[model samples]
Target chain A: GLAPLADGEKLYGKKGSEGTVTFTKAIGDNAFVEIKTGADTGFMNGCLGFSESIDGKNYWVAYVWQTKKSDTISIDMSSPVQIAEIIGTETQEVTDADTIKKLTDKIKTEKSALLQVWYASDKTGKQIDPADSASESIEVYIPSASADEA
Target chain B: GLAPLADGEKLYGKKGSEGTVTFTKAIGDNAFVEIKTGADTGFMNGCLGFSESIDGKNYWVAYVWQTKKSDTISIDMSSPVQIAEIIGTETQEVTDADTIKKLTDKIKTEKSALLQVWYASDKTGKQIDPADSASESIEVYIPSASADEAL
Candidate 1:
């Protein structure tokens, strides 16, 4: 039961320098559609997630994140689904013009993969090492749909 | 009961001249991940949608597309997680040196905003008149994420 909200509206969640927001929308029946959007002020990082409920009680879904490309992820709350929770930070180094060009080129060449990678790494539990300046990595967690099932 | 796919192996969708073929790994899940690369033949035209299935159920979680440069996308399926969807299209016409120069100059002078607006209009459902080539209008359902969502 997810409905689109007004444009430019801030979703539910605290807005930190980097934070994830989860907003619930009633689509139909007793089912509710949850849309989550995360923003990272440090770099180009973000992610989206969803979940649904039936009988107005039980809920099960996992949202995972990847550091590959900018992704728009959608989940049907009407069914059981697992979404990955992104885990780490994505690091990029642009030391010169060529690197910047290469990075920008990479961004354009594999936009989707890059975006997913960014979101995934941002959500991972790994901390961003300030000294690791050459390469960037993002850690993400893919939670099991059901505790007993994983 | 969803399990993680092997590392560097995941399903990816790519649209080409022969239409779109979703690439999957050679092993687990047997899903599509990478598309045919290179000019005019790769997944360069439209937006790419990435999906995964835990327990044999498929869920679309991300959209991938070109923005300001050329790049490659990598997904870590070994770690189960929903990924973000990348949206937008590559510039089909900016291939030649002259066109590239023109585009780069325009971008430099007008900034990324102008490039985004032009790109949005070109890729999205911009309508073209049957009789007139000079006249057109934007006709796609642009998501309202921000003040510059459509532009």
Candidate 2:
């Protein structure tokens, strides 16, 4: 069986305290991508630390992911100018048709999952709650998105 | 009493036909004047040639003196591209008194030519004209002066 690269798998780095991580795959053939995260206090803070070489010069994309316990998760690509972070309770539960409708409505409106939930009773058990959803819902902040921000 | 020098004159060519005019004076660091002839072919003909150098290049200032019977004797300093032969008679005889009066009146009206004529007539006897009283007339082509013959 072949092993898949984990979300936090360190693809390349120096011995002790410095390295880069690859979640799905390496950023190959593309100029840049937007990234948002909740880990604001680590090395990935301020900037996502991801870099791409353009004309032999490297550029980094960074963003800030903010979330409160009850409010919608707000991902700001602007300021403190650092790595991406994931915030709020990562272990919330999602159930109930009303919560699923709210999540579906939020998804339809392109709203961030700061306070959303879905029910397993809807859509033939395909509808998942926001808190219990298997897909990672962490906010990602991309520098290119916040490029115009001071 | 200074006399013309004849010792430096030498005859080298044949008997009657060939000859040369030699000068006895060797050119020195002083002013000199020479005369020449035959650079014109008409009744109104005279020439005065003087040499000068500018930026080491030699040039000549040729003063051509020409007269058309009754017309003024004009001394042109440069070679002319157009030759205007005025076949007319001299109608005006400018005298010292007339020149002075005209120049004075001109100075009063124009405020020019006063200082110029003043400086020009300053020297003694230079402004005097003995022939000013003589009747100086000119014969102009009446047909040319009046009609299609006029330019």
Candidate 3:
């Protein structure tokens, strides 16, 4: 089994942190979550794999890099259009950005795709092993359309 | 076992297309590869998982969606910075564009990272199964820095 995360934390993996993970809304996509560790580990430049729920059953998985090497790291949240634009393959470019926006927007508005975050230990001369790192998951609550109109 | 891809193809998985896969460069980053199928397969809105070799032995993987519903589909290729910008997580956004660029640039310039592409059948109410799709692999040939600098 992997090591446990700090109090109120949700990440699991090797060389775990004695730090906490908290959700933050930094006034416009500036930052979304903060990872404050008790000490510095190999968290800097680590890989973060995200499983974004799209249809309630399965979700889209995107792997990003953790570049910050401090006790408190601020992470940014991006939109679907932004995600599609950045990760185009060598053979296929995502020309239809709006198409992705439509698909992902539905996932977000319906909240069917509960977002999950994961981390894995960096292996030498190999891709990240999802099984070897720490991870965390959480559910978000957005007000209903009717509730907002009231 | 998964069905074999069309001749000269590198993809595997269910609902395979009797199509050929070819690399294409459209004057800029317009398009990189073209998937010409034997017929119209359920490739539209399918998932493509890319394994980019980053440090020779290790690589980075990114999953993208295929939204084209035709026999011939043109795919786009993006840069490392561009990729980092798009796939930001809900909790962490990729704020340092240059940092990612620098990291990926070394991967590309050194040619340590060979790129691989894969696909999987879209399962109802679940994530894609890497074992259930047609996939393909290819090597790219880029001119060396000294070769380009020959003046």
The DockQ figures for the candidates are 0.02, 0.00, 0.05
Give the per-residue lDDT digits (tens) of candidate 2, residues B1-151.
0111122321111111001011222211111111121122112222222222223222212223323232333222222111111111101122344333332332222100000000001122121111111113211111111221222
True contacts kept of each: 0.00, 0.00, 0.04
- RMSD of each candidate relative to the true structure: 22.8, 50.7, 13.5
- A best-first ranking of the candidates according to their DockQ comes to 3, 1, 2
Find the 10 residues in a row with the least total lDDT in model 3 chain A.
A12-21
On a 0 to 1 DockQ scale, where is model 3? 0.05
Q: Which consecutive 10 residues in model 2 chain A have the weakest lDDT in total?
A: A111-120
DockQ of 2: 0.00
Lowest summed lDDT across 10 adjacent residues in model 3 chain B is found at: B12-21
Best candidate according to lDDT: 3
Off by over 4 Å in 3: A1-41, A44-78, A81-92, A96-108, A114-119, A122-128, A136-150, B1-53, B56-59, B62-151
TM agreement with the true structure for every prediction = 0.18, 0.15, 0.29
Error of 2 at B130 (Å): 99
Candidate 1 lDDT over B41-134, as tens digits, reads 2112122223222332222332222221233333232322223222221001112444333323322221001000101112233311110111
Model 3 agreement with the true structure over A1-150: per-residue lDDT tens digits = 022223333331221111111222111222223343222223323222223333332233332334223332333233432233222332223435555554444433221211222232332333332211232322222222333343
- lDDT (Cα atoms) of all candidates against the true structure: 0.23, 0.20, 0.29
- Which order, best to worst by TM-score? 3, 1, 2
For candidate 2, what is the recovered fraction of reference interface contacts?
A: 0.00
